[PDB]
Structure formats: C-alpha cells, structure tokens
C-alpha cells in the first residue's frame, strides 16, 4: 500500500498520463484509491484544526462580548402597548385563539 495522501498534492505541472487525475498509468494505488483522487473532498491546508478551533472561539468570545454590552445598556420601551377595543376577541379566532392587548397587566 503506498502512503495515503490525497492526489490533490501532486504536481499539476508534472508529466502525467492522466493530467486531470494527476496519475501515471502503471502507478500503484492505495486501497482508498476511490476517495484519494482529484474528484474527492478538498483538503484545506490553511491551519491545523487545533489552531483553527481556537480562532473560531475568539469570534464566539467577541460575539458574546457584544451581547453583554447591549444587555447592560439597551433602551427601555417608549410607548405603552397598544390598547385594542375588546382585545380583537372575535376576529382573532375567538376565545380558542390568542387575543390582542386589552386592559391587562403591564
């Protein structure tokens, strides 16, 4: 069994019998040849997932930071809940459905 590496990482500019696949005709294959070829999930080589998870966590820390700031200082409501004559009783579905605002607690 040859080393298990995606064929993404071979030279595009090398002489290949199958240029699209980046493979020579007699070339030995891996037992995972099906999921190691060019038409297979791309391998992102930017950073290690250990560092990758850390960078995402900082964004979550920043996102939660804004949440706390807004929670501490966000304005109170300006207008009283709109009063509705009869609470829209009949035309919101009767007593079997939810009604509108009518002389309730605030």
């Amino acid at each position: 069994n040859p080393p298990r590496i995606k064929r993404q990482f071979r030279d595009p500019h090398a002489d290949w019998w199958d240029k699209q696949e980046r493979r020579n005709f007699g070339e030995p294959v891996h037992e995972d040849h099906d999921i190691l070829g060019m038409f297979s999930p791309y391998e992102y080589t930017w950073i290690t997932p250990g560092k990758g998870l850390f960078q995402i966590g900082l964004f979550i820390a920043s996102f939660l930071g804004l949440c706390y700031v807004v929670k501490l200082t966000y304005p109170d409501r300006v207008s009283y809940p709109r009063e509705f004559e009869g609470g829209l009783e009949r035309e919101l579905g009767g007593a079997g459905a939810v009604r509108a605002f009518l002389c309730l607690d605030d």
Partner: peptide, 22 residues
C-alpha cells in the same frame, strides 16, 4: 491570522470536510 481567518470563510469548510464528509 484574521486575514486568513476571514478569507478562509471562518474555517467552516475546513471543519465540514474533515469532521462530516470524511
């Protein structure tokens, strides 16, 4: 690092491939 964090789309695709489809 933050140029590459956002260019690489929050690294979401990187974690999708190696933890879901692979």
């Amino acid at each position: 690092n933050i140029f590459g964090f956002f260019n690489q789309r929050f690294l979401i695709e990187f974690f999708y491939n190696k933890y879901i489809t692979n």
